[PDB]
Structure formats: C-alpha cells, structure tokens
Design a protein around this nucleic acid. Sequence first.
DNA 1: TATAATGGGAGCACGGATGCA
DNA 2: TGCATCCGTGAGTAGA
Lengths: 110, 34, 94, 333, 1108, 57, 14, 170
Amino acid sequence: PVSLETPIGDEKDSFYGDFIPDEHLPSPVDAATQSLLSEELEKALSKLSEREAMVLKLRKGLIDGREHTLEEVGAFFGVTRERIRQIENKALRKLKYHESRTRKLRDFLD
Amino acid sequence: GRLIPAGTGSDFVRFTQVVDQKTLKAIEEARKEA
Amino acid sequence: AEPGIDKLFGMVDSKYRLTVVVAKRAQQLLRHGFKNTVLEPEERPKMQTLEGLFDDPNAVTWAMKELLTGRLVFGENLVPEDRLQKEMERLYPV
Amino acid sequence: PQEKNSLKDLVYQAFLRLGMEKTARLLDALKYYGFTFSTTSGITIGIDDAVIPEEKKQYLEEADRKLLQIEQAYEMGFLTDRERYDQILQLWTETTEKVTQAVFKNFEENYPFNPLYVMAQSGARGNPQQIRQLCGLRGLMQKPSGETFEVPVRSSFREGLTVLEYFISSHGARKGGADTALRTADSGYLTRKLVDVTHEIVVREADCGTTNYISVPLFQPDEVTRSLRLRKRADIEAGLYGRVLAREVEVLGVRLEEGRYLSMDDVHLLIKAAEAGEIQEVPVRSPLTCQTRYGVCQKCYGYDLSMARPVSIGEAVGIVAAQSIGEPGTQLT
Amino acid sequence: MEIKRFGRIREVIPLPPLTEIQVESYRRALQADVPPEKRENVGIQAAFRETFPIEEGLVLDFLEYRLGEPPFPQDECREKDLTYQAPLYARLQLIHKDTGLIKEDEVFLGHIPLMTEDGSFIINGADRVIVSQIHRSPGVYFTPDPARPGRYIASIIPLPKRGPWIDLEVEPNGVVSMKVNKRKFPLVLLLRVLGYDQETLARELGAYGELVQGLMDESVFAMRPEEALIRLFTLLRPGDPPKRDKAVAYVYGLIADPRRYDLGEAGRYKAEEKLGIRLSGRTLARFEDGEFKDEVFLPTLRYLFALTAGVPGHEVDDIDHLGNRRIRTVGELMTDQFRVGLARLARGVRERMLMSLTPAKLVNSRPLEAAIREFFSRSQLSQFKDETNPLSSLRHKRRISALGPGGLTRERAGFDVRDVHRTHYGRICPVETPEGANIGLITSLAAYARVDELGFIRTPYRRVVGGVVTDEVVYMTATEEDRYTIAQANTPLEGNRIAAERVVARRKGEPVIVSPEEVEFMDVSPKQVFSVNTNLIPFLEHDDANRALMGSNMQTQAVPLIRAQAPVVMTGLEERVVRDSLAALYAEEDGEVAKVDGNRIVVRYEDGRLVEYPLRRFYRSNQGTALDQRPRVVVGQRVRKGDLLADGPASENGFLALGQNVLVAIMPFDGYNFEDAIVISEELLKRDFYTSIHIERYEIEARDTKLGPERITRDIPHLSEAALRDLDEEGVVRIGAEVKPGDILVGRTSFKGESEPTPEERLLRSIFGEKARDVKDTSLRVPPGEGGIVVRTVRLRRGDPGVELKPGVREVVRVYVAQKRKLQVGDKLANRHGNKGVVAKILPVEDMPHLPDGTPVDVILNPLGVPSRMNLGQILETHLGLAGYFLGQRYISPIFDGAKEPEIKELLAQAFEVYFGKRKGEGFGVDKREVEVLRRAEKLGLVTPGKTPEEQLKELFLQGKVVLYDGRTGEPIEGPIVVGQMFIMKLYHMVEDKMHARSTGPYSLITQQPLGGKAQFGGQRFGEMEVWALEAYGAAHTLQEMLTLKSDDIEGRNAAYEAIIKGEDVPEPSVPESFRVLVKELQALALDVQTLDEKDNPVDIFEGLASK
Amino acid sequence: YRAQGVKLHDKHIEIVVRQMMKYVEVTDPGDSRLLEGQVLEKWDVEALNERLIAEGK
Amino acid sequence: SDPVRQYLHEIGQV
Amino acid sequence: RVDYSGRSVIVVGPQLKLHQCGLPKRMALELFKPFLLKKMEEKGIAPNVKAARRMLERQRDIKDEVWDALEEVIHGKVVLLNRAPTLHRLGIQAFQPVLVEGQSIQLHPLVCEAFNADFDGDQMAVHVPLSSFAQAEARIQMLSAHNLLSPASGEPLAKPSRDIILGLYY
DNA sequence: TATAATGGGAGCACGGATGCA
DNA sequence: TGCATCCGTGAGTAGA
Ligand SMILES: NC(=O)c1ccc[n+]([C@@H]2O[C@H](COP(=O)([O-])OP(=O)(O)OC[C@H]3O[C@@H](n4cnc5c(N)ncnc54)[C@H](O)[C@@H]3OP(=O)(O)OC[C@H]3O[C@@H](n4ccc(N)nc4=O)[C@H](O)[C@@H]3O)[C@@H](O)[C@H]2O)c1
Ligand SMILES: [Mg+2]
Ligand SMILES: [Mg+2]
Ligand SMILES: [Zn+2]
C-alpha cells in the first residue's frame, strides 16, 4: 500500500488522501432515496387491507427485519399456509394493479 | 459547530418571539379563560 | 436594498433582533402555508411567471413586508412556546 | 467639479439624511450617468497626451550646471565624498519635484482637459508621481543595497529609457516586488493574531454603568516643543466620531449632553471650539475604560461605524476590530 | 505584405542556439557520440570512474560503458506511456589478485532517459523539462563576521552533498576555530595532523601581527601527528573508540577521499584563483606515503589573517556576484543522481562479494535504475513541461531555479538572493520572474547568455581597440567583466569607429562617462540584457518594468489560434523563436517540392533522394492546446536550405503568432470596460478570430476484481438505446460523435459488491418481477462542463500483441475529445505590455464605435488602465498599428533601437493620405459630425485654429486620434479617439475550464468534509478568514450551516437534503463529525475530552456507540 | 496608519490594547491562596479582592 | 541521543 | 469545505442594481438543485424527485421548463459572493442573483473596491444560504446595498470610482 | 542446526522562555 | 544578572 499522507503539490500544502472519496457512508441523495422509498412503499401498502399488507410486510422482512415463512405467517393470522399464500398472491396482485395505474414506484427500480 | 454568541446568536436578541394579533388575542383569551 | 429596510431597523433596538423576528415569522408562514398571514389580498407579495402573477414563494420577503405593517407583535416572553405552537396549530392546521 | 472626495462626501451626507435605500438608489444613478458620460466624453490616451513641459530641459540644464559646482568643490577639498553625494541627491530630489510641478502647472494652464491630468485630478486614475514618470523624468533609482545611484533617470516613459536606465530601474522594481511578497505574510500572521486575541469581545449589554472614561486630546506638543498645536482634523475625527460623551460639554453656546453620540457635525463643532480656545480635550466613553466582562457595552463602543448609528448589542466588535486593523496591513510601507 | 524594419544597431553575432543550455549539457553528460576510449572524465563517465574500482570476488573494475538504441521512437513512447530512453551497458572485469583470476563481462544497468531534439524528455509518456539550478559556487569565501565587525569568517564550500562546509574563524579568546558538522575545535590540531610544526606556522602566518600567537598552542605541537590525529578523532566522535586506523579512515573521508569530498572543477578553479595557489586534486588535503598533506587550509588561513590585518589585495566576497553563483544544468543534475544510484549499487556489490562469481552476479542495477527514475519522475527540478504554445516550452527550458534539492527553500530566501544583482546584466533577465512568493527565485537566462564549462553564465562583448570597434566577440564571466570599461551598444559609430567624445559605459556595473580611448569593450546589443520573452515586447523602453514583467510572462500563456497572426509590430525575434522551438518544419537542403498533403510533405533534394516529412496533426499538448503543423508550400515549389516547409502551432509563415491583430479604440464604454474588463465586437467571433482547438483525454480501466471482472461493454443495465446511441459494438463511443455532459464515452460494468437487499428492495423486486442484475454501471461519462467531438479512441487489451498493463488490469480505454472554442465572456485577453483583462461584453457590430467610412473597431480598451500602470508601449504600438493598418504593412521595431515618434508620424501622414484622399476622390467632403468634433479638438488644443478641416483631421491623425462615431446613436464621440492596430493574445485561462458549482457530492474519508477541486466535484473552501467574515456580520446561522449542514454534520446534511426536496424547512444542525474526530484523536493522545452540561455532567456526543 | 493615508478609528486599536492589558501579577497574596508573582486576569483578582474585602481579609 | 551509539557502547562494555 | 457552493470568473456588471449580481444558469442549476427538484415536482416537469434528477443528469435532457422553474426557485433569495483573500467582513457580501447565460459571474462596479476585485481574471466563490434564518441574515445584515460605510473608518466604502468619477467630473 | 565469523553509517530569523556563565 | 540554548513561528483561495 501507499501512504495517504503522500504529498501532492510541489509546495507542501496537500495530501493524496484528500483526493480520495468516501464510498461507504450513504450520500445525502442515497439516504433521501431510501427514505422516499420507505414512504412510497408505505403509501402503496395502505391501499391494501391491513391483513394483506401485514402479510407482505412479514413475508418481505419490513417488520422485524426477518422474512417469515408461509407456515409462520399462516400460524400468526391463524389461517392455512395455502390461505396465507393466496392472501399474499392477491396482495401482490393488487399492488401490481395500483402500480400499473399510478406509475409511482417505477422510478425506484433504477 | 455551535451557534456563536454574537449577532443573531446573542442571548440578547435570540429568544425574541413573533406573533400576529389574531393568534395573540386567541391565546390571550385562553389564558383569560382559566 | 430591501424595501423599507430603514424603517425596519427603526423598529428594533438591535438589528440582529430584526433578523430573528423576520426569520421566525418566515418559519411560521412556511409551516402554516401562509394561511396565517396578516396581509390583505392586495398587500400580497407577487411574482411574475410566464403565465402570470402568482404569490411570492419567498417567506422572508413576506415576513419583512408583514413586519412593515404593524400587525405583528414581537418581543421576549410573550407566551409559552408549546402554547403558541398549539394555538397556531388550532387556528391554522396543516 | 465633482471628483472623488466631493462624491464620497455626497454619498455620506445622503446616507445620514436619506437613509440607505435612498443612498443605494443615488449610488446607482451616479453609476449610470457617470458611465454614460465617460463613454461620450472622448477620453483617450495617445502618446502626445503625455506632455513634456519645455521647462524640463531648462531644469535639466540648470541641474547639469549645479552638478558641476558640486564636482569642482570635491576636487578642491571643500566637500567630502559623503557631503557631495548627499548634495547631489538633494539636488536631484528638488529637480524631480521641480519637473513634477512643471508638468502639472503646464497641464492646468494650457491643457486642463488633458486625459492624464483629468484622470489624476478627479481621482479617477493616477497620482502625480506616475504622471511625472510619464511626462517629466523617472528620477532617482535605488541600488540593490538600497542606496541611491548618483545618475538619475532623465528619461520619461514617453521619451523611453536607455537599456542602462532600464536595468537600473529593475533593481527597485524587484526589491518592491519581493517586499510586497514577504509583507503579505507578516500582515496575514498579524491579522490572525489580532483575531485570536479579540474574538470573544462582543457588545453584550447597553451599559456597564462605569463612571470612568478617556480624554481625547485636541492638541499635541509640536516637535519644536515651542507651543501646542491643533491635531490634524482626521486624527481628531478618528478619535472622536461616533463616541458617547462621558460628561456634559458646553461650547459655542451649544450644550452637548452626557450620553450623546458625537456626530460628524458634533466633532466639527468641537474642533471649531478648540480653535476658539474653549476646550482642549473631550471626555469620552471607551472600550479602554469599559467594565463589561467578556466584551464591551453599547455606550462605550459608540457608533457601529458602518451604520452611522449606535452599535447594536450582539455585534462582534472584536473581529471587526482585528479586520479593520489587519486589512490595510499590506499597504504599510 | 511589406515589412519595414527600424533601428541603427547591427548585431555582430546572431542569437546563440536557444535551447543549448539543455542540449549541450545533456550531450556532454552522456557522451554517446564518442567512442568509449575517447571519453573524458566528465559526466556519467566521471560517475563510473568515481565509483569503480570496488575493492575488498576480490576487485571489481570498470572498463567502459555504452548506450544502445532507443527500443521505441518518441511518438510511440508518448502513445504507450513509455519513457524515451536508451539501454546502458557497462563492461566490468572482476579480478582476483590472489587467484590471479580475471572474468570480464558486459552487464545491463537498465535504461537512461534521452533528451529529445528540442531539449526535453518523455518520462512515462509525458514531456518533462529539467530546470537548471542556480547556487553558490564551491570555493573558498571570506565574509564579514556579523557579530564582531573588524573580524571575518572564512568558508570552504564543496559541491552539494559532496562533503561538509568548513568554517575558519578567529574566536574572541584569540584561538582560530574550525567548524565542521556543527563542531568547533582549534584549527591548530588539524594543522598538526597535516604535518605542520610551530616553526613553519611562525614562518608563514608570523607576518600578520598577534594572530599567529592566537594560533600558537604548546600541547598541540607537543604531540606527534598521530596523537593529534587520534585527539581530533576523539573531538569529532565522542564515544567512538579512538583506534588509529579508524581515525585515519574517517579523517581521510572527511578532508581527503575524492569519493566523499569534492570541490567542483569550478570550486577548484575558484579556490586556486582566490588564494593564488595550485590544487593538485579537487580535495582539501591528500593521503601520501601514509600521512596527510595539506592543499587548501594553510592558504585559506593565510588569506583570512591577511584580510583581518587589513593587508592590501585581500577583500571580502559578494556571494550574490554571478562569479560566485553558478548554474547546474540537466547534465550535472542527472549525473549527480547517477552518482548516487551507482554508489548504492556499489554498496550492493561489496555486500555481495563476501558470500564462482562473475560481474553479473555481483551487480544489481535496481538501485541505479531507482535513482534515475526517481530523479526524472519525482524531483522538484523535473517539471511537467509547459507546452501551451511553442514559446512557453522554449522559456521553460531556459528557466533558472534557486529552489529544488540542494538549494534554497521558500521563505528561507531573504531579499539577498531575490534581488537583481548588478552582475545579472546580460546574464539573467531583470524582468522575467514570477510575481508573488517566487519572485526572484525563478528567473530566466538572458538572450545572448551562455553557461560555460564551469557553470558560470557568460555574456558576449565586442573588443574595442583605440576607439575602433572590432567584430571580435569575447564571452565573459562576471569576474572577467569586472576588469573593463564597457560601452553601451547604442554608442554612435561612423563605420567601426566611436563617433562620440563622451561615451556611456560600465565599470563594475557602475555607469560612467568616458572617452573612446578608455573603451575596452562594447555591448553586442540591448537584446542581451533581457530574456527571450521580454525581447518580444516592442517599445519595451516605454513600459514600466512591473507591467513588462506581466506581458513577458503572459506570452507563455497564449493559446494557439486557428487563425493566428504575427504582430503588426514585431521586435525581430519572432522567426528565431519558431525556428529554435522546433515548432515549424524547414527544408534540410535545397530542393523541389514533390508532394504536398495535409498529412505529409515530400521533397526531392539536389542529391536526388526523396525525403518524406510527416506532419503532426491535431496532437494534444500537456496543457490540452492543439499542436499541429500545416503545409506552407505547394506541389512543384522550389525551396532553398532552411526555407519553410510547414507552419507549426501559433506560427504564421514561420513568424511567432501568439494572437491576433485587432483594431482597437481606447475609450471607456458604458462601464463594460470598467477596471480592466474588455469589450469586444461580435464580428471577432464571426470571422473566427480568437478561436482555438483544445483536446481532452479521458481514460478508463477494466481490471480483475475479487467479485468478478470489470469489462468494457455496450450492454449496460437499465440504459436506453437513446443512451447507448453513439456507443460502438464494444461499448466505446464512435469517432466523430458529439458528446455533452452526462454522455457515455466508454461503457463499463462492474460486478456488484457483497450485499443483501434491505426489505424495501425485496418487496420492490417482488412488485415489479425484475431480477436485480449481477453488475452495475461504472461507465466513464463526460464530466460537467466538458465535451466536444470524439476525434480518437485508443483501446489496449490483455492478451494482445506488444501490450502489457499494470498487474490486475484487463483493459485500458482512452477517448480523445476535441472542442473548438470561440472567444466568450470571461476569457482572458492580453497584450505584450502587460495589459490584461477578461471579456465582459460582446457587442453586435452595429453597436461598435466605428470610423466614418463604416469600419467598426474590434476591441475597446479602457484608457484608465494606462496612467497608473505606466506601460505606454501599447500606445506607441497602437499608433504604429494605425499607420500600418492603412498602408497594409507590418513593422520590426527592436527594443531600445526602433521606431521613434517622428518616423511614426511620417508613416501616419502617409497613412492619412490613404485614409482621407480616397474619400475626397469618391466625391465626399467633411461631415457635419467631423466639424463638431474638430471644434472640440480645437478647444482641447489638439488642432490649430484657422486650418482647414482636412488639415486638422491630419493633425489629429498624426497624434493617432481619429473621429469616431457611436454605433448606438450616430453622433460622434465628443473628442477624437485613439484607434489603431494592437496585437492581443487569448490566454490559457478560460472561464469554460474554471466554472464550477456543487450541490452535494463526494466527502473525505476521515473528516467527512466535501472534497476539493473541480475534477473531484468538490466544494469551495470556507476557511478561517471567511468564518471571520460571517462572525463579523454576526450571521450566526449562516455560519453554523457552513460548519454543520453544508459540511461534516452527517445527520444534518442528510436531513437538510431530504427536507429541501420535500419543501420542508431545514433541520436544526448537530455535532459536526470533525469534532468527534478531534475528540477521538485526543483520546488517542491519552487526554480525556469531555463535553459537559450546565450541571457538569458528561454529555455523550457519540450517542452510546463508543460506550460499553 | 496615518502615515500611509489609512483612516482607521481609534476604538478598533483600543479594543486590542484592552486585551493586551487583560492580566496582572500578584505582588502579595494578602489573605488569598494566590502566590507572589502569579499572573492572572484583572477581572478575577478584582472579584477575589472584593470577596476578601467583604470577608475583612 | 543516538540510540545505536549508546547500544554500541553498552555492548562494548562486555 | 462546504456544499452548495461554486466559483467562477467575475466580469463587470454595469447594468446590475447595487443589490444584484449576475449568476450563470449552469451554476445556479447545481447550487439550488434540490430546490429545483422540488419545484420541478410541484410543476408538471417530473413525476417525482428521482425522475427530475435523472432528467438533470444528461445535459440534452434539459428543457426550458426547468429554467423557468429555477427562476421561480431563487425568487427573492440571495447568494453570498466571496473573493479571497477575505480581509474584512465586506469580502463576503450578499446579492440577489440575476440568472445569465454564459459562464461568468457578473459583479457590480461599486462593490469592487470593498472586495478588492477587478477584471484581470479574478474569480469569486458563490454560496447559497439554505435556511430561512440564513436568508434573513443574508438579506438584512450582509446584503451589498445595506453596507455602504466602512466598519473601520465609517467613510463610504461603496462610492463612485474610476469611470463613474471620470464621467461625472467631465 | 556446527569451518570462523564479535562496535553503524550517513550527513532564514526572530522572538520568548529557559538554562548556565 | 547577562550570554547561550532550544523551540516554535512565518496570508488566503485556486491547482496539483
Ligand atoms: N504554475 C504551473 O506550474 C503551470 C503548469 C502548467 C501550465 N502553466 C501555465 O502558466 C499559467 C499559470 O501561471 P502561474 O500560475 O505559474 O503564475 P501566474 O500567477 O502568473 O498565473 C496566472 C494566473 O493564474 C492564477 N493564480 C495563480 N495562483 C493563484 C492563486 N494562489 N490564487 C488565485 N489565482 C491564482 C491567476 O488567475 C493568475 O492570473 P493573474 O496572475 O493575472 O491574477 C489574476 C487575479 O487572480 C487573483 N490572484 C492571483 C494570484 C494570487 N496568488 N492570488 C490571487 O488572488 C487576483 O485577484 C488577481 O488579480 C497558465 O495559464 C498555464 O498556461 C503553469
Ligand atoms: Mg485582480
Ligand atoms: Mg486594481
Ligand atoms: Zn462600558
């Protein structure tokens, strides 16, 4: 490796490290984007029923961070795993419909 | 990175409040309520 | 020069106090969507677009013009902060 | 005729009387008409606009005459080497002055609308020295060691320098450049020092209620120490203007109350009073005497000099001081 | 058109080859054109002879070296980012004296960089110039002791890094003290080591009263030279065991060993000449027959004593005399680094000798290659070459730096070395120096000056014998020049004889009036006092030095123009510059032009051989100015030897063309020319004056990574055919394509990092049923404000012929983008007199001030720029330009010898006839407007009352003033205006390059603060002084924003951005990151920093993250 | 400054000069805890001194 | 002052 | 170093009012960019913020709607101009930007003396005050037309000079 | 892991605060 | 008490 303190200018005013960007911390734009994405997903999940939106939220990990299995979400709502699978299917279907009309979430696909 | 104690950051001028007469009387009658 | 700046300075013991008043008032206008303004319809700050005259979006232009009218009361310890904010939220929700 | 000083005074008076919105308007009008007329006025520079006064030749010839009277007096032993060199320097200094006066008198009498003359007189551009070098002689040049050459530069930039003259000039040019270069750093360092020592000083309160004050002398002992003379106007202004009176001052029938901020007019009045022998010194509130902790007070500081009105509490007067002192720093020779 | 040249002075000799200071120096260092046995002990030959033989295999010796041919030509070297260099081999014989063994082999020492034809190097693809270095000549000097007036210091100075400075002083106590390596000690002791006895010193130094008594010490003469040697060694080296052979070795290395201690050949000569002695070698003493024998010390101490005693013929030394300061050219510098690398290679040799051995086994050339590579790449004196125009390169090569390794540091240089010394005359230009912090530290070699074999700068003079000026020209150093009365070059001559009974001359720089009987020498020319640049300023005698400096320097900043012209008024150096700068192309022998193409010219010479000269076409210089040669001859044309085949960049028919000749009016215009700003006519754009070509080079790498290969591809995730439109099949933009900011130059995809999607990503991917790709778009795009036409694309791939990249790199693409830049607002213009300014207004032709015949002016310069600046050369240039504008001719008006007013007036009169008479014959009389203006001029004293209108207009014209109508109105400008032709250059500072803004962007790693500079998309520095300005206004919130929201408060800038795009008010700022950094760095220093609340409780600004 | 034609108000210089005088040196501790030759701010020693005058110390 | 010299000395004491 | 800042070459502004400065469009688009995004969303110009930014990324995707929008964004707002070295407080001053074509910042004549600015190739830096508070400070306290007198001597700092004096004298 | 080897090598200038004559 | 020593300091922004 090379030293971050390697001089740049001819006078000693300047370090090489100083021309090196930080790629780790999210830019203000990045942060803003994930914010708008959480808010837009939340806007789109309110056009569902509380149960089907909760099913998608528990299935994709938006709730506790973990993505639950169909048997677990079906055990949570007290229904059959096939039933919760179908509630999931119609939820996702309604989301695709509202998306098709509103155009709102498309831009976030990069 | 604090707000300096001079100009608009002075303890002399910085706590100054603005309120319009409508909101002012609206509060004034509410504190005259109790 | 900001219109009426001399009178504006006339109003306060310290110019920095003028600045604070104007800034806070503009925060209020911004928060309440201007619905709380002390300006009459014909006193409203205007901006000329392509289409036509629209309300001036600049809240500080507004706040200053308001301050010029006399309709605003400024000072220290006029009213508890939470109470002011709540009475304003009641009077002009948003 | 309106020149730099008259216009500056107009702006100041208009500030005092009409306020800053109006003065900004006046400034823009002055700007506009000034530019407009300067376009059509026919101001230009040809080589013939640098006018060599005939007198120069005479003044030169005469110099060469006295230049002999010194030389001879060296050979005969009446003059040392030092006294001779010093007499030559004095001669050429007085000659340089002579041809300057010649240049400007010639302009004023025969060519009052000459571009160089107008530019210099108005304050638009140029000072007498630069005009002299253009028209009269460049004058004396300095050696690298700093001591002056015996031979002046007789040429003007109009006439053009000899390569030897030119080379002689370059020493001074370079010493001047290196001096500027090395001075800006010392000025910078000084400024940062002053800022660091003064930064916490802010106007924190309207009055510290001190009874103490400083007395601004309106007179100074002369270098002859023969008598006391009135200080220069600007010195008095710089010590007085915008200050709060520490005590009531009664002069010329006018009563200046205690607590009064001295206007420029109040100051002029006091000066005229001192001229009439009614007062030799003015009691005044000062940061020197202020009892405010961590800064000064409004009364002790006086005017915010930028607004021509009492300073607003909260103003950082320390930084303003350090900057006000530091800024001219590169101009000190 | 016709060229009239003024001036009486005839130059007896032409200007010396202008780059010879580089060319000859390096030619001499390498000695490549000499057969190995015929080489002298100068140069890298000196290096080898000094390093070898290597003793204690047993002995390794050096026979000869050789330089091979360059493996690649120059253009190829620039293409592939290689170094233009030749292989270096050395024949070495390893000898064993015990074994009687001899093994002889030619070893490869690596490569050495070659200078090109023009005096520059190509180092890793970029052109570099090695700048010469002025310094104190080695030798023996005597300066006054600043502390004790009446006492002196003798100083013995060798070459840089050639051993210790030694000081001989006479101490207050009376004993003479020698100072070496910051250790004082009685000189007597060393004198005893040298074999001196008390009687010998009493003999020699006795002549000078009481001093030698201070030199006299009993105990010292008591002990033998051996004992005094060991005593001295114990004085110099405390703690080192006082063994005698150890002491001998050390003191030998210090004062004797030629491989350790070296005076220059310059230092040798100087010591000899000052002390009036003869030096056997280049060292202070010798080792002969087992003992030390003196050379320098006694003569030195002698001179010191004699000086102290006030003995005649002994004087102090001016250290700023150009006899005591010498130039170290490229050859000397490179040879010095060669000497270093070779000494290291030799340490490696000796080290390897102690462990079946040949030379190739004993020798590692890595340290040598490293010393050379380090000198050329990373030295301060090795400068990225200034090729903006050809003159800039020429000037670069002729630079003299007081800076660099083995020289002064900035701020450690007082007025002394920055000064113009009297001895600079004809040697170093008194004018051309940088303004600002480097003033006087960087200078330029004078036009006629030469650096001699000893490194001293010499200027030519003409021998004058008995008032007769011969054509014999002697080149003198400053010390030699100090002997003579030298007449000025403009001294009147009838034929070869001095025609004046009083002549202006110089004796030791002092101006003096003498007789032709007293004149020993005479100046060759005034040209010799100034640099090459300063010599291109007409009427320079009428320009104040400070502005002349600016014009002089700004000429090297001129951009080559597509329509470029030579000045209407030239000094006469314009052709020699183009010739020596190797810009243009010339015919080698007499001949006939066979073929002419845009790309190539083919010429058949007398001999009959058919020679093909290829032309460099739209090549990008270091500075991005376009360098290209254009054919100046047509098929079948008969050419002589030296005739011009092709014009280079910024050349018009082989004359230096740095700019344009425009018609100027000097007059204020509506504030648009306020404070040095300039108003120009739109017509200038219409005819493409001031239009310049610039080429930018963009580069991108695809390298092997751990997550996959990066690759150049047209297939870029989530991009429209709109976006990929101009991309070729491989992903690289096609030649000819116009690119604008945001456009793709080269497509590249990189494998995505190690990541798991956040729940939002998962849900989103579910909603759209689009699988997230393995790669992301890393494509090189045109940066903000850049772009143009793509004129070239180079591609280099791994696995391809003759191609090898840095380890890990699969492929490198370089795209070239050319732009034609019209003159625009903010671009910088300047004349040769140091009048400079930016274009603030471009007026339509109908608004320009115009002559009565309808001709509009091009440029309006403000007269207010003249009087305080005192540069009138531009005024005279303008008058001469008016005259030459109507006569259709150009002039050569050399410096200090050139067109005076009366001749300018003659030309102006002739011009007036053309200007006016044409109109009078066309059936037009004077205009009512002209009558009004004439009335005004009459009142101004410009014209004589009573004369006709035509006569008065002529009277104005002879003053270079014309009636000028206002384009806006048609009313005349109330007074008459100076209008004429001026030569104005467009400089390298273009607002296109400097305009930059940033909203948010990259942040620094540690500080979390915005990066710097346009290229990094950086933020402006708001530093201590600006903060002070905000404090002084008492704007607390603006300040707090600068300190937090707008820089390193992470939460704050994030929140601020989000809130601004939502239309919310900006949030209250929080703790700036650099403060947390300060706290943690202070914790690292074992100091506990604690932010507290008003109750003196700890406040956590780290929000729990750092506390267990 | 006057020599160079720079008009500058006295009070700016007076503020800095005031800072130059900010400190004092103890020539006797009296009843305080302070040491002879100790340097400190004039304000602090004035406060202390009036506290000790209030105590009768 | 110079650690190598010092260590050399100490070494030389045995 | 700070965000929301730029720099360019200054050029004389004779037409300008004392409180105004010429600011290039290309610069202003970047300096006020987030505001321009919000405004582009309020108007029809983009579905949302991200589309607006993407549309600003490529220079050929930019249309006059965004220019008029940017005009609406800066209305009433000021920017700070700064020239180094900043010797006294007047080395930073506040101006209302007038958007101009071309890449040079246009500076008012009467402020040159205070900035020690001239047209020989000087450059200035621009800063956007973000908050209503920063804008209040900027417009009331720092605005060019509000500081006419030297805090140092009390004499007019912004005053006729050069060509202005020349013409009035003439 | 065993012949014996035993001490390095390069390298301006001013003020202020303190230590030493 | 005064001479000598060690230590710290020497403008900004750009840019590279
Ligand atoms: N310097 C190189 O190594 C180099 C490499 C490659 C090519 N070139 C060419 O030479 C020109 C650059 O010359 P230099 O930079 O070496 O020297 P110079 O001062 O004469 O440069 C001319 C302009 O560059 C600007 N500059 C330089 N240093 C600057 C600093 N520290 N701050 C701001 N600007 C700086 C500047 O614009 C110069 O123009 P002027 O000298 O006429 O001054 C214009 C105004 O700028 C301000 N200013 C200047 C200088 C300093 N120190 N501070 C300032 O504030 C003032 O307001 C001034 O009125 C290139 O063109 C290239 O061809 C060199
Ligand atoms: Mg400038
Ligand atoms: Mg200027
Ligand atoms: Zn007070």
